[PDB]
Write a protein that holds these residues in place. Structure first.
Motif, PDB file in Angstrom:
ATOM      1  N   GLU A  77     -52.351  40.117  -0.292  1.00  0.00           N
ATOM      2  CA  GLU A  77     -52.172  39.783  -1.914  1.00  0.00           C
ATOM      3  C   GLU A  77     -52.703  40.782  -2.769  1.00  0.00           C
ATOM      4  OE1 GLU A  77     -50.652  35.614  -1.810  1.00  0.00           O
ATOM      5  OE2 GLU A  77     -50.486  37.195  -3.089  1.00  0.00           O
ATOM      6  N   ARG A 114     -44.547  37.774   6.137  1.00  0.00           N
ATOM      7  CA  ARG A 114     -45.518  37.349   5.216  1.00  0.00           C
ATOM      8  C   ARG A 114     -45.561  38.331   4.000  1.00  0.00           C
ATOM      9  NH1 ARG A 114     -45.851  32.488   5.902  1.00  0.00           N
ATOM     10  NH2 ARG A 114     -44.739  33.279   3.992  1.00  0.00           N
ATOM     11  N   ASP A 140     -42.701  38.185   1.835  1.00  0.00           N
ATOM     12  CA  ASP A 140     -42.933  36.981   1.016  1.00  0.00           C
ATOM     13  C   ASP A 140     -43.607  37.495  -0.206  1.00  0.00           C
ATOM     14  OD1 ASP A 140     -43.273  34.668  -0.335  1.00  0.00           O
ATOM     15  OD2 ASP A 140     -44.569  34.116   1.432  1.00  0.00           O
ATOM     16  N   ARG A 142     -42.538  37.912  -4.174  1.00  0.00           N
ATOM     17  CA  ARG A 142     -43.237  37.166  -5.033  1.00  0.00           C
ATOM     18  C   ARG A 142     -43.831  37.951  -6.429  1.00  0.00           C
ATOM     19  NH1 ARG A 142     -45.066  31.657  -3.848  1.00  0.00           N
ATOM     20  NH2 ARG A 142     -44.624  31.088  -1.798  1.00  0.00           N
ATOM     21  N   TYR A 143     -44.305  39.213  -6.025  1.00  0.00           N
ATOM     22  CA  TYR A 143     -44.710  40.007  -6.970  1.00  0.00           C
ATOM     23  C   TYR A 143     -43.578  40.686  -7.713  1.00  0.00           C
ATOM     24  CZ  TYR A 143     -49.551  38.946  -5.796  1.00  0.00           C
ATOM     25  OH  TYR A 143     -50.911  38.413  -5.507  1.00  0.00           O
ATOM     26  N   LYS A 170     -50.534  45.370 -16.758  1.00  0.00           N
ATOM     27  CA  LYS A 170     -51.840  44.807 -16.101  1.00  0.00           C
ATOM     28  C   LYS A 170     -51.210  44.145 -14.756  1.00  0.00           C
ATOM     29  CE  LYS A 170     -55.388  44.194 -18.950  1.00  0.00           C
ATOM     30  NZ  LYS A 170     -56.134  42.767 -19.002  1.00  0.00           N
ATOM     31  N   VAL A 171     -52.197  44.376 -13.676  1.00  0.00           N
ATOM     32  CA  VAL A 171     -51.888  43.584 -12.558  1.00  0.00           C
ATOM     33  C   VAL A 171     -51.795  41.866 -12.754  1.00  0.00           C
ATOM     34  CG1 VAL A 171     -53.053  45.367 -11.109  1.00  0.00           C
ATOM     35  CG2 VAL A 171     -54.216  43.094 -11.536  1.00  0.00           C
ATOM     36  N   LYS A 172     -51.055  41.280 -12.116  1.00  0.00           N
ATOM     37  CA  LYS A 172     -50.548  39.772 -12.440  1.00  0.00           C
ATOM     38  C   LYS A 172     -51.867  38.906 -12.238  1.00  0.00           C
ATOM     39  CE  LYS A 172     -45.605  40.455 -11.966  1.00  0.00           C
ATOM     40  NZ  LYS A 172     -45.798  41.864 -12.352  1.00  0.00           N
ATOM     41  N   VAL A 173     -52.690  39.368 -11.452  1.00  0.00           N
ATOM     42  CA  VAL A 173     -53.884  38.349 -11.079  1.00  0.00           C
ATOM     43  C   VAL A 173     -55.161  39.134 -11.420  1.00  0.00           C
ATOM     44  CG1 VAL A 173     -52.423  37.868  -9.239  1.00  0.00           C
ATOM     45  CG2 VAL A 173     -55.062  37.210  -8.941  1.00  0.00           C
ATOM     46  N   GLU A 223     -56.780  30.510 -12.196  1.00  0.00           N
ATOM     47  CA  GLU A 223     -55.734  31.360 -11.731  1.00  0.00           C
ATOM     48  C   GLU A 223     -54.509  30.369 -11.243  1.00  0.00           C
ATOM     49  OE1 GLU A 223     -56.917  35.621 -11.929  1.00  0.00           O
ATOM     50  OE2 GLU A 223     -55.243  34.636 -12.025  1.00  0.00           O
ATOM     51  N   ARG A 259     -51.131  38.089 -18.293  1.00  0.00           N
ATOM     52  CA  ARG A 259     -50.991  38.657 -17.165  1.00  0.00           C
ATOM     53  C   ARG A 259     -49.834  38.090 -16.055  1.00  0.00           C
ATOM     54  NH1 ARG A 259     -55.356  41.834 -14.342  1.00  0.00           N
ATOM     55  NH2 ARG A 259     -56.968  42.224 -15.860  1.00  0.00           N
ATOM     56  N   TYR A 260     -49.753  36.677 -16.267  1.00  0.00           N
ATOM     57  CA  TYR A 260     -48.484  35.734 -15.508  1.00  0.00           C
ATOM     58  C   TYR A 260     -47.212  35.661 -16.095  1.00  0.00           C
ATOM     59  CZ  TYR A 260     -51.814  34.264 -11.865  1.00  0.00           C
ATOM     60  OH  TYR A 260     -52.593  34.153 -10.751  1.00  0.00           O
ATOM     61  N   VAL A 269     -43.449  30.779  -7.360  1.00  0.00           N
ATOM     62  CA  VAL A 269     -44.886  31.198  -8.059  1.00  0.00           C
ATOM     63  C   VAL A 269     -45.320  32.567  -7.481  1.00  0.00           C
ATOM     64  CG1 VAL A 269     -45.621  28.725  -8.038  1.00  0.00           C
ATOM     65  CG2 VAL A 269     -46.456  30.286  -6.343  1.00  0.00           C
ATOM     66  N   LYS A 270     -46.077  33.300  -8.217  1.00  0.00           N
ATOM     67  CA  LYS A 270     -46.013  34.705  -8.020  1.00  0.00           C
ATOM     68  C   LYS A 270     -47.132  35.045  -6.880  1.00  0.00           C
ATOM     69  CE  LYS A 270     -44.748  36.336 -12.458  1.00  0.00           C
ATOM     70  NZ  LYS A 270     -43.924  35.264 -12.922  1.00  0.00           N
TER      71      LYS A 270
END
Lengths: 385, 385
Positions: free
Chosen positions: A84, A108, A111, A115-116, A233-236, B84, B115-116, B234-235
Motif C-alpha cells: 500500500e 494484488r 488491484d 484503487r490509487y 498530498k498522498v491519499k493516506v 482512516e 486527502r481522500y 475504496v482507495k
C-alpha cells in the motif's frame, strides 16, 4: 440505566492458543526470545527508549536490505501495508505503472494501484517461471511506465524473480523500481542499493519470525525525489512517507506525533532482527537454500511433482502439485489434527492446485524439514484413493 | 557476496524497556494478564483458533460499544487507522463532510477527508467547550453534508462531546454520523445504536490498556448501505470494509485471505476486552469518572486551573493550564527522571498551553490518582520560582 448488549459468556472462558508447527508460507514459529520480549511493559510512542528501539531497528533493516537509504523505517501495518505505502506515495492519478506478474502478488499490486488511480499495465510470466530480463525490457519499452513493480519471492507460485540489471534499466527510462521481499528476504540474496531498487519492503512474520503486523520499508533518494515532485498530498496520512519518516527520525526534522507505534511489536521485531543480524545474511540465506534442497530431494524421492520451474525456485515457499485424486484440504486437516503441523494449500492462481510448504526462520532446520516431509507424506497417503 | 552494510553493533546490546507509570493520555499501563498473553505462540491468520479469538473480540466490542451491528470488527492499524477507514469507506470524491471540531482531532479528520477527495467543511466549538446541538444543527443546515464527524473524547482539549439526539438529527437530513471514541470509550457513557451512530471506532491502548496497534470498528446498516451504493472502489484495499468484514466473518460470505492478522495483538486485545467486560460498563465508567473527580479536587486545591469548561470534561484526559513561569517540558522531564512517571504536554491547538493527565484503565485508581497528584505538584514546584 439499561444495557441491551450483555457481557459475552464467551470471554469468561480461557484464551486458547495451541502450539503448532507452522510449516505453511507464514507466519513462522516465533523464537522464544521474541515471545518473551513481547511481555515487556508498554512504552510511550515518543519516549526516548522507544525512539532508541526504532533507531536500532533501522540499522538492522539497513543491514538486512543492504541499503544506506536515509528513508528507512517500518510501517504500522502487516505486509500488505508495505505494498500500500510504496504505491500510495509513488503514484498520482493517471501515472502508468507496469506490474511484473509472477503470481498472486501481481494481481494484488495491480488491484492497489488501480484503487490509487494509476494506469495499470501488466506483463505476465510463463507458468511457474520468473520473468526474463528480455521480457521486462520489452514491456518497459512498450508501456513507458513511471513505476515498475516486481515481487522477488512470489509465495503463491514459489517463484524467485531475478533482479540484476533491472533497476539500472528502469533508470535509463525515468522509471522507479519497487520490489516486494516479504517472502524472500533472508532466503535469497538481496542487495537493495547495488541492484538500484527504489522502494522495498519485507514482512515481520516470515523469515524473521517476528509477530505479524509491522513492516520494514525503504525508499531511495530517487523515490524521495518523486515524492517531492507530487502535486497533491498522498491519499493516506497513515502511510505518508514524509510524516512517518519524520516520526522515525529520517530527514532533517523534529520527531513529532504521527501515530502511537505498538511497542509490543517493536520489541518482537527488534529481537527478531537482532537474531538475524547475528546469524548474518550469508549464513541465513545459505541455511534456507540448503533446507529447501533437502526438502526437494525428499519430495521428489516420494514421487511428488514441484510446481515451479527448477531454475526459478524460492527457498522459503515450495509449491507442490496436488496429486491425482487427493483432497488437499482433507490432507491438511489430517496433519493438523494428528500432529498440530500446518501444511497449506495454494493462493490466487494456484488455489486448489498446490500445497505450499514454508521453510522460514525457526522452521528452516534439518529437523523441521524432516518432520514436515514425514507428516506431509503421511497426510497425503491417509487421504489418497 | 560483498556486504557494504555490516551487522549493527547496537543490536548486540540488551533490549531496554523501563517500567514506567504512563499517566499521559496514552498508552496506559497494560494489565499483567495482557502482557502475559502476548508471550503466547503465533497462530495462522486463518486457523480456527484465530477466527475464534476474532469472533470473541467481536462479541466484546459489541458489548463495549452497545451495538448489535453485524459490520463489527477490528482494523490492523493504530487508532488513526479507525479514522482512516471510516472516512475512506464512507466518502467518495466531492462528498460534503462536516467536521465538528472540538480540538486536534477535528484537524486530523479534516486532513484525512481532504486527502481522500472530500469537500470538507468545519464547525468549531468555543474554546474549551463541546459543540451544542444548536451549533451542530446550524452547521448541518449551512453545509448539507452527507457525513458528520465528531470526536466523543477529544484528548487534545480534555473535552467530552455530547451525542444525544445528533445521530437522529443527522438522519433527518440524510447524513451519516461517524464518532471517534478512542479516548472516551469506557470513560464516558456510549450507546452506539441507541444514539443512532453510523460508524465508530476506539483504540486498544487507552482505557482498555491493550498494546497499541489494533482498532475496534463498527458500521451501522445505514453505513453499510452507503458503502453498497459507491460507484468507485475504496482507495485502500487494506481498509476496505467489505474485505476486512469478510475476513472477520461479518457478511455471511466465506472467510478468505485479506492480510495476516497479528496473533500477538489479538491476544492482548482479547484479554483487555475480557477484563473490561468482566468489570462491566457501569462500574468501569463510574471508576474513571470518580477518579477524575478526585483528580480535579486535588488539582484545584493546589491552585491549578483546568482548561476545559466544567460542563464538558472528559474523565480520561484532564487538561490543565500551564502556570505562569513554568516550563512544561522541564517539569515533564523532572517527573520522568525522578519517578519514571509520565506527565504530558498539549497536542495541536493546546500545544505549549496545557499539561495532560490521563486516567485510563489500570491507572484509574485512587492510588494512582494520588501518585500523579504528588508527582505533578512536585515537578511543577521544582521548575517554578
Amino acid at each position: 440505566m439499561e444495557y441491551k448488549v450483555t457481557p459475552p459468556a464467551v470471554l469468561r472462558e480461557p484464551l486458547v492458543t495451541p502450539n503448532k508447527l507452522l510449516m505453511g508460507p507464514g507466519p513462522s514459529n516465533a523464537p522464544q526470545r521474541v515471545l518473551d520480549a513481547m511481555s515487556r511493559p508498554i512504552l510511550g510512542h515518543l519516549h526516548p527508549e522507544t525512539l532508541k528501539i526504532m533507531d536500532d531497528i533501522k540499522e538492522g533493516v539497513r543491514y538486512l536490505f543492504q541499503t544506506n537509504n536515509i528513508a528507512t523505517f517500518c510501517l504500522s501495518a502487516s505486509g500488505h501495508g508495505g505494498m500500500e505505502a510504496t504505491l500510495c506515495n509513488l503514484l498520482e492519478d493517471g501515472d502508468v505503472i507496469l506490474i511484473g506478474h509472477t503470481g498472486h502478488w501481481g494481481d494484488r499490486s495491480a488491484d492497489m494501484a488501480t484503487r490509487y488511480g494509476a494506469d495499470v499495465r501488466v506483463v505476465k510470466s510463463k507458468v511457474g517461471q520468473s520473468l526474463s530480463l528480455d521480457e521486462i525490457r520489452d514491456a518497459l519499452l512498450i508501456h513507458k511506465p513511471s513505476v515498475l513493480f516486481l515481487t522477488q519471492g512470489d509465495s503463491s507460485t514459489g517463484v524467485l524473480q531475478g533482479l540484476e540489471g533491472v533497476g539500472a534499466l528502469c533508470h535509463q527510462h525515468n522509471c522507479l523500481l519497487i520490489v516486494d521481499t516479504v517472502a524472500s528476504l533472508g532466503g535469497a540474496p538481496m542487495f537493495m542499493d547495488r541492484w538500484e531498487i527504489d522502494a522495498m519492503y519485507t514482512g515481520s512474520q516470515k523469515v524473521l519470525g517476528a509477530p505479524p503486523g509491522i513492516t520494514p520499508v525503504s525508499f531511495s533518494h530517487r523515490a524521495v525525489e518523486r515524492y517531492k515532485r507530487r502535486n497533491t498530498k498522498v491519499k493516506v496520512y497513515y502511510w505518508d512517507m514524509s510524516l512517518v519518516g519524520d516520526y522515525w527520525g529520517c530527514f532533517g526534522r523534529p520527531r513529532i506525533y504521527h501515530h502511537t507505534i505498538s511497542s509490543t511489536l517493536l520489541y518482537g521485531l527488534r529481537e527478531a532482527i537482532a537474531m538475524a543480524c547475528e546469524e548474518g545474511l550469508p549464513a541465513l540465506i545459505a541455511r534456507h537454500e540448503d533446507c529447501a534442497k533437502r526438502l526437494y530431494r525428499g519430495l521428489q524421492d516420494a514421487g511428488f511433482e514441484l510446481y515451479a520451474d527448477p531454475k526459478d525456485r524460492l527457498s522459503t515457499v515450495t509449491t507442490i502439485k496436488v496429486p491425482q485424486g487427493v483432497d488437499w484440504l482433507k490432507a491438511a486437516q489430517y496433519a493438523m489434527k494428528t500432529y498440530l503441523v500446518e501444511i497449506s494449500g495454494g493462493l490466487g492462481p494456484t488455489a486448489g492446485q498446490v500445497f505450499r510448504i514454508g521453510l522460514m526462520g525457526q522452521n528452516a532446520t534439518t529437523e523441521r524439514v524432516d518432520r514436515v516431509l514425514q507428516v506431509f507424506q503421511e497426510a497425503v497417503a491417509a487421504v489418497k484413493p
